[PDB]
Amino acid sequence: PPVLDLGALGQDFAADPYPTYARLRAEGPAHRVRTPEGNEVWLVVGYDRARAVLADPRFSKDWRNSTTPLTEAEAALNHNMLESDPPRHTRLRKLVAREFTMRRVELLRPRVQEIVDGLVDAMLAAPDGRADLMESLAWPLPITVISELLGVPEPDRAAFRVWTDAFVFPDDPAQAQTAMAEMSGYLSRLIDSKRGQDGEDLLSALVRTSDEDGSRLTSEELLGMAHILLVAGHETTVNLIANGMYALLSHPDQLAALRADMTLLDGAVEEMLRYEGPVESATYRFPVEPVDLDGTVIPAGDTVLVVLADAHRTPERFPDPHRFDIRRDTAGHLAFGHGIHFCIGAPLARLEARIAVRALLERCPDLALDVSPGELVWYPNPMIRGLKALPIRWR
């Protein structure tokens, strides 16, 4: 079959990619596409095959296994655990695994609660009882939490929304590359500013680790670590909060059920992940050798994107897939991935989303979507499922 041009859609395809993916899945697990940006990649669709490929060591994450060239700015940031295989992956993840356990993350709850409380305070001061939920809460919450953990100073934080807007939806490819070079330059200076300062934030601890033994964490890896810990959880958590609140406000029966029984909160957040999680397609995977998927052979070195969004709409795995049901059995969803790269941030993301969702329901009487669903606009990006704005209102 010819390469499917996703740009030529659709539209449209950004607003509702699901029928496109489903049509592909009916034909088989693996498809050549051209993304709206213009890149020729493979999509893997269908829950069982997506789950298998996420964890299959035949599919590498190390760019040395890719035939796609990297720009200088891109290459400077790729020595990180998500863009590594064992043994490098194993070594890098061990340096920070203890910081992100459920137990350690649970210690942040009072502070996360305080941040949320103050953002909702500020939101509810609006004299017209209207806000954009992105601006008021979904954007500032995750950046505040992760900045405090890592040690990014408050005046430095606004620059990250500008850079992430550029990575997500860039005026042209060159502004994404400038954003990258700037962010890398900034992080290197931030890292340098910690040296000798006896800071106790995570970035300071990583700097001492690297300085004490460059074989345990090299200077490139120190920069890649600050980068991945900041970027991997940013656009994702922001959009979990926004997509999830959208799901709730556009399914009032479910909103009412959760209001009526707040013990349903954790399962509601799991169904937000399943139903409309922020990661539409996983990060790039590169076969180390050719891989046959049901008669379709993907060449060594090609780019493969696992379509988590389609996995989650596979009816054999999640019956009545297009129903948002906060009581659904969500076990096995792929929203945080699967296998050795499974999200290290999952406990922190869940903590943030659960506290945010609870705060909004509890403190916004008659909370409502303030435009019709058809008026919302989704960013076109093939990796991220995320809204431009989320107008809400309350009483």
Ligand X SMILES: CC[C@H]1OC(=O)[C@H](C)C(=O)[C@@H](C)[C@@H](O[C@@H]2O[C@H](C)C[C@H](N(C)C)[C@H]2O)[C@@H](C)C[C@@H](C)C(=O)/C=C/[C@H]1C
Q: Which is nearer to ligand X, 326 or 390 (CB)?
A: 390
Q: How far is CA 290 from CA 30, 51, 59, 281, in A?
A: 13, 19, 10, 21
Residue type, 224: G
List 44's β-bridge partners, or say none.
Answer: 30, 306
CA distance 279 to 309: 7
How do beta strands 4-5 and 30-34 pair? parallel
> Of 57-65, 227-235, 263-271, 387-395, which part binds ligand X (CB under 6 A)?
227-235
Q: Which does 335 bind (CB under 5 to 8 A by kind): ligand HEM, ligand X, none?
A: ligand HEM
Phi-psi region of 294 (alpha: psi -120 to 50; beta: other; left: phi over 0): left
Does 176 carry a binding-site annotation? yes
Q: Determine if 392 is a binding residue for ligand X (CB under 6 A).
A: no
Please pick, from the candidates 43, 202, 228, 249, the single residue that binds ligand HEM as defined by CB under 6 A. Answer: 228
CA distance 285 to 225: 19
Does 283 carry a binding-site annotation? no
Q: Determine if 249 is a binding residue for ligand X (CB under 6 A).
A: no
Q: Which of 38, 18, 24, 22 is nearest to 303 (CA)?
A: 38
Q: How far is CA 163 from the centre of its chain?
A: 15
Q: Which does 167 bind (CB under 5 to 8 A by kind): ligand X, ligand HEM, none?
A: ligand X
CA distance 159 to 186: 10
Does 177 carry a binding-site annotation? yes
List 40's β-bridge partners, or say none.
Answer: 34
Q: Are 193 and 199 in contact (CB under 8 A)?
A: no
CA distance 133 to 136: 5
Q: Which is nearer to ligand HEM, 112 or 240 (CB)?
A: 240
Q: Determine if 237 is a binding residue for ligand HEM (CB under 6 A).
A: yes
Tokens 């999200």 belong to residue: 343
CA distance 319 to 220: 45
Q: Determine if 232 is a binding residue for ligand X (CB under 6 A).
A: yes
**What is the smallest separation between the CB atom of 236 and ligand HEM, expressed in angstroms?**
3
Q: Which does 383 bind (CB under 5 to 8 A by kind): ligand HEM, ligand X, none?
A: ligand X
Q: Which is nearer to ligand HEM, 307 or 349 (CB)?
A: 349
Q: Which is nearer to ligand X, 180 or 203 (CB)?
A: 180
CA distance 282 to 332: 16
Q: Which does 380 bind (CB under 5 to 8 A by kind): ligand X, ligand HEM, none?
A: none
CA distance 121 to 205: 34
**What is the smallest separation between the CB atom of 47 and ligand X, expressed in angstroms?**
19
Q: Which is nearer to ligand HEM, 35 or 370 (CB)?
A: 35
Tell me the site size for ligand HEM, rule CB under 6 A. 26
Known binding residues for substrate = 83, 176-180, 227-235
Residues that bind ligand X in the complex, under the rule CB under 6 A: 37, 82, 164, 167-168, 176, 180, 228, 231-232, 235-236, 279, 283, 381, 383-384
Residues that bind ligand HEM in the complex, under the rule CB under 6 A: 54, 81-82, 93, 146, 228-229, 232-233, 236-237, 240, 277-279, 282-283, 335-337, 341, 343-345, 348-349
Known binding residues for heme = 343
